[PDB]
Amino acid sequence: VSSGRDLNCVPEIADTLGAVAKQGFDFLCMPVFHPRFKREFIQEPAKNRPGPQTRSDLLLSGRDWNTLIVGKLSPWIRPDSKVEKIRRNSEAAMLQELNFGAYLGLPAFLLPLNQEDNTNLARVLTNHIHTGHHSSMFWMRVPLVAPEDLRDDIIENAPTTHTEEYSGEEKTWMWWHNFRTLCDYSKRIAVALEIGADLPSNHVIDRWLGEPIKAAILPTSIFLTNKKGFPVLSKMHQRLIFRLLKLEVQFIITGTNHHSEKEFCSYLQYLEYLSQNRPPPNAYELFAKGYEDYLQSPVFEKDPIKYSQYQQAIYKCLLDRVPEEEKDTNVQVLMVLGAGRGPLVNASLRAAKQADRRIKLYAVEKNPNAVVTLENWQFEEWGSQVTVVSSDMREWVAPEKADIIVSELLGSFADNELSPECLDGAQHFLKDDGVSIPGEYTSFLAPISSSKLYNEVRACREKDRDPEAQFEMPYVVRLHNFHQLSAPQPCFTFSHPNRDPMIDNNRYCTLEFPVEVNTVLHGFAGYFETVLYQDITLSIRPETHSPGMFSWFPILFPIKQPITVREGQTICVRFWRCSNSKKVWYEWAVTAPVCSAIHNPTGRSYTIGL
C-alpha cells in the first residue's frame, strides 16, 4: 500500500522525515511555510518584514523533495474571504507558496475545498498552472461530508438539520465540480478525498465514481478500538477501502495518535492487512492490469472460452444437419470467413471429430500475411480437407454452395464493424437451407459518467484535424473509473442469413434511459450479445457476460460537452448506423434532458472503409 503521513507541525524537517520513514510511510504531507506565519504584502510596517520567510531548500536533497514531500497550503490563506485586504494578501501568499512548491520540485501540493465559494482560489491556481508548463500535481482536500453536516447536536438555539436533504448531502461534490469546471478540467488537478467519522448515504459516495481521486485522507478519529486495543475500522468503512484500493489511490493518515499505547505504524498495519485480505482478482482483472481506463482508437488466440463456444456451436449444428445413419455418406461443406491464423478452422475440425461427422473446409482470408500462416498449416497439418481461398470473393466462384458459414464478429482478421455488409455479400455461396455462425447479434447502449475518461478523450486533440474530432469517434476502452447511469438497452440487431427482398443495414434507434441519481453524462458505453447456434452464445454485456472472455472490450461513444442529469430525469439517446456505397459510420446525439450536437455527421471524424 502506497501511504503518506499528514502533519501540520514539523519542527525539525530532517528528524521528522526520518521518524515517519521508520513508521513505514512512503511520503510526507507538510507545510512549505509555517501555518501560523501570517504574511503581509500591501500594508506597512508589516510589509517590510525581515527574512527568511521559511526553512531553506538545502535542508533536504532534490531527490527527497521530488519523491518524499507533498506540499500544503497555509490554513490562513483565504482567497475567497469577504474582506478585500485578506483577499489580496491571500492571493499574493498563495502564489508565493505555489511558486516555492515548484521551486522545490514537489510531486503534489495540497489545497483545501471547505466552502461553496472557491472561485478566486480557482483563478489564482489556474494562473499558476498557465505560468510555465509543468508536471506538478494539485490535490484538492474535499471531505465526504461537510463539517457543517458533521458537527455534534450541542447548539441549543441552532439544532442540526434532521430533515432529508438529497441534494444537500451531495453539496461537497458540487464544491469540487464547480472548482474543476472553473479550472477547465486541468489534468494537474485531482481529488484528495477526506473520510468523515460517520459515512454519508451510498448515493453521496457514488458521486465520486469516475472522479480523478489520487489520494484518500483517513483521520485517526474515525479509527475504532478493537477488543485487543488496536486501531480498526467499521465494515462500511472497510467497504470503501476495498473500492479505493482498486482505484490505486495513496492513503494519507492525519491527526495525533489517539491509540497512544500503540505507535502510528498500527494505523498503517491495518491498511496493509486489508490489502492482503481483499477478494482475489479474476481472469478478466488479471489480464488487463495496465490497460485500465486507457482508451484506444478502433491477444485474440489467448482466449480459449471464445473458441470453445464456436466448437460447441459447430458440434450442435453438424448433428442437427446430418443424422447418425449418414455419418459417412454425407459430407458437410464449411466456409470459414476471415480464417486469420486458423483458430476458427482448428475449432471447426475439433467439432467434426467430437460429432464424428464428415466435413469439407474452405479457409477464406483476403490478408496475404495471414494466408502464409494458413497455407503453412494446410501443408504441415490440415492437408486436402482444408482449401485456403485468398482470391477476391466477389470475382471467385465456389465449386459448390456451403452448408455452414463460420465467422468472427470482432478481430484483427475479422471485418469488425463491417460484419453485416460482409456476411450479406457472402450468403450467395451458401445453400438455401444454409446456417450462419453467428446467426444473430445485438448491440447494446448504456449512459456512463466518467470525468476521468472525458478528460482522457479531451487530451486526444491532434494537429492537422478538427479540434473536436476526438469526441466524434468511438474508442475501445477497459471501463475502470466510470459509472453506468442506467441498464444497457438493445440498440440494433442483425440476422444472418437475411432473406429480405430489400437488405438495408442502415439503422436509427431512440433509447430512453431513466436515471434515479444526480450525475453528469460524459458518453455512452457500447456492448454486444451474439448467438452462434441455438443456446451457445458470446456476450460482453455486464448482465450476461461470458465467463473468462477478455478478448473483447466495451466501445465508448463520447459527447463534445458533458450534460448535467438530475434525479428522476431521463437520458434520451439517438443513434444512427449509416451505410453508404464506399463507407460505413456511426452518428449519435442526446435529446433529453438537454440537446446535444449530432456527432460524426457524414462520418467526417470516423469512417470504416467498405
Binding site: 501540520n8 507541525c9 514539523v10 519542527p11 525539525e12 524537517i13 509555517h34 501555518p35 501560523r36 506565519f37 501570517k38 503581509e40 500594508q43 510596517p45 508589516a46 517590510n48 518584514r49 527574512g51 527568511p52 520567510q53 521559511t54 526553512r55 531553506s56 535542508l59 490554513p75 474571504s81 469577504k82 474582506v83 485586504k85 485578506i86 471547505n114 461537510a146 463539517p147 457543517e148 458533521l150 458537527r151 455534534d152 447536536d153 450541542i154 447548539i155 441549543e156 438555539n157 441552532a158 439544532p159 483521520p219 485517526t220 478519529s221 492525519t254 491527526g255 495525533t256 495518535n257 489517539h258 497512544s260
Partner: protein, 310 residues
C-alpha cells in the same frame, strides 16, 4: 542565563502574561528558519525583557507556542502546534521550568487556551474544529465538543462561572457555553451575519456583557441577555487579534491588531491611547498588577514595549 534555559530566544513573541506578584511570563515561537520550535520564559524584572542573559527562568518546548495562560502562580498552560496541551510547573526556587504533562488530543494546531475560574479546569480551541474541557489535576479530557464547522479562533473562560465560557470560529459563530445544560453550546448571534469573529474578552465586573473583535478591525460591545449588538467602533484597519481589560474598578479595553498598532478604549469604545511602537503584528498585552497605568505589549518584531496609559 539560568541552567537548562536556551542561549537564544525565538524572534516571534506570541504571549506576554503578568503574574499577580509583578513577574512577566513570555511565550516565544519560531515561525521561520531551520527549527520551528517554541520556548517559555520568566522575568522578575519586566524592563530586562527581551534580553536572554537577564531572566529568572527559561525552557525550550518541542514545538511553537500559539497561546499561553497562567495556571495560578506556578503553572503554565501551553497551546502547542503539535496538537498537544502542555502544563509546565515552575521550580520551588523559581529558577527552572519542568514539564508536568504533554497530552496529544487535538488532531491539529491548538490555537487558543483559557483557564476556567476554579483554576483546576481549562478549555482549549484548536484548528481541528474541536473544543476540549481539560482537568488540570487528573491530566485528562472531561468532554470533547465539536459544535463549530471551521477552525476555533478564540476561547475565553467566564471570570467567575466555571460552566460558562465563550468560543468563536471562522464559521461566523459566537457560542455561549454552559456544561450544566444537556446542549451546552448556545449561538449568541447578531441582527446580521457580518465579518468573522477573531478575538473574545469577558468583562471583569459585568458578568453579563462581553467584547469581540472581527477580521475587518471592528470591536463590538455585546450583552448576553439582550442577544443583539448595541455599540461598535472601527478601531483598526486589519484583523483584531486580542482584547484585554485593565485591573481598574472601571476597566479600560486594550485592542490588539495585525495592522502593527495598539489602542486603549473606554466603556463607549472611544479611543484614548494609540501606539505605533511595534513594526510587526501585535500579539499579546498585559497590565501590571503593581501599576494599573502600565501596559506591556509583545510582537513578531521581538519587541517588549512598556506603555503609560493616561
Amino acid at each position: 542565563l539560568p541552567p537548562n534555559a536556551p542561549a537564544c530566544m525565538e524572534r516571534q513573541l506570541e504571549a506576554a502574561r503578568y503574574r499577580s506578584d509583578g513577574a512577566l511570563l513570555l511565550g516565544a515561537s519560531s515561525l521561520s528558519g531551520r527549527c520551528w520550535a517554541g520556548s517559555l520564559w520568566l522575568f522578575k524584572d519586566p524592563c530586562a525583557a527581551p534580553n536572554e542573559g537577564f531572566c529568572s527562568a527559561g525552557v525550550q518546548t518541542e514545538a511553537g507556542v500559539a497561546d499561553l495562560t497562567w495556571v495560578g502562580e506556578r503553572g503554565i498552560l501551553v497551546a502547542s502546534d503539535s496538537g498537544a496541551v502542555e502544563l509546565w510547573e515552575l521550580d520551588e526556587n523559581e529558577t527552572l521550568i519542568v514539564s508536568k504533562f504533554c497530552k496529544y488530543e487535538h488532531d491539529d494546531i491548538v490555537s487558543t487556551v483559557s483557564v476556567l475560574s476554579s483554576g483546576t479546569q481549562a478549555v482549549s480551541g484548536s484548528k481541528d474544529i474541536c473544543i476540549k474541557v481539560w482537568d488540570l489535576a487528573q491530566q485528562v479530557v472531561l468532554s470533547s465538543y465539536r459544535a463549530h464547522a471551521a477552525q476555533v479562533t478564540c476561547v475565553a473562560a467566564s471570570p467567575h462561572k466555571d460552566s460558562v465560557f465563550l468560543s468563536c470560529s471562522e464559521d461566523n459563530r459566537i457560542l455561549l457555553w454552559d456544561t450544566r445544560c444537556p446542549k451546552p453550546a448556545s449561538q449568541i448571534g447578531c441582527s446580521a451575519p457580518g465579518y468573522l469573529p477573531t478575538s473574545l474578552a469577558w468583562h471583569p465586573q459585568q458578568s453579563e456583557v462581553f467584547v469581540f473583535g472581527d477580521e475587518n478591525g471592528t470591536v463590538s460591545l455585546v450583552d448576553t441577555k439582550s442577544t443583539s449588538c448595541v455599540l461598535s467602533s472601527a478601531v483598526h484597519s486589519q484583523c483584531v487579534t486580542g482584547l484585554v481589560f485593565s485591573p481598574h474598578s472601571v476597566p479600560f479595553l486594550a485592542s490588539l491588531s495585525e495592522d502593527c498598532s495598539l489602542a486603549v478604549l473606554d466603556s463607549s469604545l472611544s479611543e484614548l491611547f494609540r501606539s505605533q511602537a511595534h513594526r510587526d503584528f501585535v500579539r499579546d498585552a498585559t497590565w501590571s498588577p503593581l501599576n494599573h497605568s502600565l501596559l506591556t505589549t509583545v510582537g513578531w518584531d521581538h519587541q517588549v514595549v512598556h506603555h503609560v496609559v493616561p
